[PDB]
Coordinates of C-alpha atoms and ligand atoms in Angstrom, one line a residue:
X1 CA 29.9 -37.2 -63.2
X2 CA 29.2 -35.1 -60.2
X3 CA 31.4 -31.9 -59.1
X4 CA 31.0 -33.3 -55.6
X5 CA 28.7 -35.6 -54.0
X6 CA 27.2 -34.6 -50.5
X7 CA 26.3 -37.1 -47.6
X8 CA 26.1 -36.6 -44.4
X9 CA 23.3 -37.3 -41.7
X10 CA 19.6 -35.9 -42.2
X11 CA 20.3 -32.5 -40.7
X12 CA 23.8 -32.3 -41.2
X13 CA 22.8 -29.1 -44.5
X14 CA 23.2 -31.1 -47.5
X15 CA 20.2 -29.6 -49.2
X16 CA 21.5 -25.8 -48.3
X17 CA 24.9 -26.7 -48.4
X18 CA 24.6 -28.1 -51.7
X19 CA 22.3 -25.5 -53.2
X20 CA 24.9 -22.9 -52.2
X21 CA 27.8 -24.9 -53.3
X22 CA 26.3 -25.9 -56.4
X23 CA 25.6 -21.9 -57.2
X24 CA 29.3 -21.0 -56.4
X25 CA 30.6 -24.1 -59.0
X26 CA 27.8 -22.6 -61.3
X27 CA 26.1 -26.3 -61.3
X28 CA 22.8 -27.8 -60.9
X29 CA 22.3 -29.9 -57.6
X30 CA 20.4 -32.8 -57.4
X31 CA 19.2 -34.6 -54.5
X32 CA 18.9 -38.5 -55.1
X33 CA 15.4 -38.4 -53.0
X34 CA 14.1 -35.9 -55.4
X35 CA 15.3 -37.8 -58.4
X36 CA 13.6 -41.3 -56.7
X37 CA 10.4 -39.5 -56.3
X38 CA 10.6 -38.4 -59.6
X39 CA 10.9 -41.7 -61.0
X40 CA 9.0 -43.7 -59.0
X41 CA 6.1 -41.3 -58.8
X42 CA 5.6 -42.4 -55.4
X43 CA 6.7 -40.3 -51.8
X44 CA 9.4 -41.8 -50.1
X45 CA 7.3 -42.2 -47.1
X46 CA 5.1 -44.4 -49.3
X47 CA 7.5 -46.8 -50.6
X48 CA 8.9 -47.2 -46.8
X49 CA 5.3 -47.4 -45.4
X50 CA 4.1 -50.1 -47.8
X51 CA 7.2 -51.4 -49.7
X52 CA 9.6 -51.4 -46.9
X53 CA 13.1 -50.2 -46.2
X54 CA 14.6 -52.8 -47.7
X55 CA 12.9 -52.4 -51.5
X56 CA 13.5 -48.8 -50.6
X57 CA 16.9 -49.1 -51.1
X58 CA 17.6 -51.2 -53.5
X59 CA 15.5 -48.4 -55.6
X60 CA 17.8 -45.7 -54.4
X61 CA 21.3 -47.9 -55.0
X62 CA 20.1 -47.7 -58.5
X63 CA 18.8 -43.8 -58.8
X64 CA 22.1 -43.3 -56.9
X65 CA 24.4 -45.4 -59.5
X66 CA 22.4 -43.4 -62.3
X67 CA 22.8 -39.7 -61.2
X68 CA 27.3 -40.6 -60.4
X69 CA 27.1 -41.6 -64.3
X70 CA 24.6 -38.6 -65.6
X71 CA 24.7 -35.5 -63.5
X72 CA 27.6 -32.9 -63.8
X73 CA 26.9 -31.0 -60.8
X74 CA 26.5 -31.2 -57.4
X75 CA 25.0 -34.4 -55.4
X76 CA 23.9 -35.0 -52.3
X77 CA 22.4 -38.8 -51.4
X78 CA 19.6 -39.6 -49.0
X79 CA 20.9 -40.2 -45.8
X80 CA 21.0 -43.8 -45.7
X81 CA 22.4 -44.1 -49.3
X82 CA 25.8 -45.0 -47.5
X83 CA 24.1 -48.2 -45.4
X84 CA 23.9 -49.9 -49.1
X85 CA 27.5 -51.7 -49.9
X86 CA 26.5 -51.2 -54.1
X87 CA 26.3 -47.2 -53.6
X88 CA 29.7 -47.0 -51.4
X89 CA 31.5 -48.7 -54.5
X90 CA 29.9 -46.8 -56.9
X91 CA 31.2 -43.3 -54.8
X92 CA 34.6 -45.3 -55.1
X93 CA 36.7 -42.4 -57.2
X94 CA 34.3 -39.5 -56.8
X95 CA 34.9 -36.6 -54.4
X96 CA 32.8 -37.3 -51.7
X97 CA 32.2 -34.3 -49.5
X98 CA 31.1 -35.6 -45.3
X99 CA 29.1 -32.8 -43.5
X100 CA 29.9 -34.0 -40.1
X101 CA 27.2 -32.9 -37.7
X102 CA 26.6 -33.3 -33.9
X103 CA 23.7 -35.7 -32.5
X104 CA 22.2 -32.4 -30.7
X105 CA 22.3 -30.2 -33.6
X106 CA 21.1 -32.5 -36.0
X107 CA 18.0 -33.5 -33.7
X108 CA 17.4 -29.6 -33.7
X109 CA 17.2 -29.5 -37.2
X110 CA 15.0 -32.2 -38.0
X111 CA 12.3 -31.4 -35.6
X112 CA 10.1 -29.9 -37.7
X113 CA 7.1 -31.8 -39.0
X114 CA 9.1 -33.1 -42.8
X115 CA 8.1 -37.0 -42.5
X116 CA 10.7 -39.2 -41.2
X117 CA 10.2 -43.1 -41.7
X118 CA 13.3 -43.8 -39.7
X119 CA 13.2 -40.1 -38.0
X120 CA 10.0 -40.1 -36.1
X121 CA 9.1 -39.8 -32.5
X122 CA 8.9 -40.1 -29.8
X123 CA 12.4 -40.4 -28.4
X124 CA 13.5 -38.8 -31.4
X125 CA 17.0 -37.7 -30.3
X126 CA 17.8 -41.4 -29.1
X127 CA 17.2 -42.7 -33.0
X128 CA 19.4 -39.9 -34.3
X129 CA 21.8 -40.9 -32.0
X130 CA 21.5 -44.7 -33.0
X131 CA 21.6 -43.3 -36.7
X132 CA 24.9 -41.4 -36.0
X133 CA 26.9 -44.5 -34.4
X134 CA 26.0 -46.9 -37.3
X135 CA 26.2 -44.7 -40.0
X136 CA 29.5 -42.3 -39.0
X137 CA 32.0 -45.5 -40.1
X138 CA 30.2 -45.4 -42.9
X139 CA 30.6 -41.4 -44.2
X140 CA 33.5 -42.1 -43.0
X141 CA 34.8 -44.5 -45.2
X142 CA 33.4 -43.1 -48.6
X143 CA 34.4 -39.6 -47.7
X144 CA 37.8 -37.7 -49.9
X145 CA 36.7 -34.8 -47.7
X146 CA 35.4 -34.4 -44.1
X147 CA 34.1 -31.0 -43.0
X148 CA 32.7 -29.8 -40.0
X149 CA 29.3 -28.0 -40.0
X150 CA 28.8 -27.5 -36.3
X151 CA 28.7 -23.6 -35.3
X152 CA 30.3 -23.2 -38.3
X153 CA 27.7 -21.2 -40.7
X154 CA 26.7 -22.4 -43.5
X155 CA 28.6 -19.7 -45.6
X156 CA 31.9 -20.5 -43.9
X157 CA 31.3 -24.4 -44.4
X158 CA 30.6 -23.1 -48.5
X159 CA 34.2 -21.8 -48.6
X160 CA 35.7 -23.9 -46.8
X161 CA 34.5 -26.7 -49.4
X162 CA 35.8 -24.6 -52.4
X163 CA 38.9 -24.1 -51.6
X164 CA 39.7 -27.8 -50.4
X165 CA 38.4 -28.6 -53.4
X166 CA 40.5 -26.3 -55.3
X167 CA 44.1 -27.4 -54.1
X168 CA 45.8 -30.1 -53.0
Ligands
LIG1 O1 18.2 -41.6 -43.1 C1 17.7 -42.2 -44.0 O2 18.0 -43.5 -44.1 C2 16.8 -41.6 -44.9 C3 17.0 -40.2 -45.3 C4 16.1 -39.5 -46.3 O3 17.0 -38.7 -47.1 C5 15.3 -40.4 -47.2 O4 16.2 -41.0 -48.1 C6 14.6 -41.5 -46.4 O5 13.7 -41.0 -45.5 C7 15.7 -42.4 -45.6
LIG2 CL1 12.4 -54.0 -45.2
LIG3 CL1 12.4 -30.8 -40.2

């Protein structure tokens, strides 16, 4: 089972977030899009482009529900992971870490030209924003530990993670 599971909004750091943190518990991360690319030998844009969302996630639920059982170190879920009722009981028991973001930080994080099925513009900031009301209940509700990563560097946000996790 993981160290810590990530989730959090696309932008909110999970990948360098959870490449530092896995370093400083001496772990290997794994990202769940990574690990459905991997299996599926398809790009995720692929599977939403001819497959649709909905096939999409059931294929994650179940890369999600394999990497809580197999992988010891640190994991952060796609951001929609959390919209899928089968992956927020299955996170039931594990330390969940929430990178909290805001809705203008995140959209200046993800405007770079990664590929974005449910990301993409224009109007850009107004999805995020839609993403961020439907989904924050959501982190919300699976999360042991909420943490800030607004101004806060990423660094900070590292240690600030370690030692929450470290005592009650
Ligand atoms: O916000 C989302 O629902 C997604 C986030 C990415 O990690 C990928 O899992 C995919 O593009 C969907
Ligand atoms: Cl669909
Ligand atoms: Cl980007």
């Amino acid at each position: 089972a993981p160290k810590a599971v990530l989730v959090g909004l696309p932008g909110s750091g999970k990948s360098t977030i959870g490449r530092r943190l896995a370093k400083a518990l001496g772990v290997g991360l794994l990202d769940t899009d990574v690990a459905i690319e991997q299996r599926t030998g398809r790009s995720i844009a692929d599977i939403f482009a001819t497959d649709g969302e909905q096939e999409f996630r059931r294929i994650e639920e179940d890369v999600v529900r394999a990497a809580l059982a197999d992988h010891d170190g640190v994991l952060s879920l796609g951001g929609g992971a959390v919209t899928s009722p089968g992956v927020r009981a299955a996170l039931a028991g594990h330390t969940v870490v929430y990178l909290e973001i805001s809705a203008a930080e995140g959209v200046r994080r993800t405007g770079g030209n990664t590929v974005r099925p449910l990301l993409a513009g224009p109007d850009r900031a107004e999805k995020y924003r839609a993403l961020m009301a439907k989904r924050a209940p959501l982190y919300r509700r699976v999360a042991t530990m909420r943490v800030d990563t607004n101004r806060r560097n990423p660094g900070a946000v590292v240690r600030h993670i370690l030692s929450r996790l470290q005592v009650p």
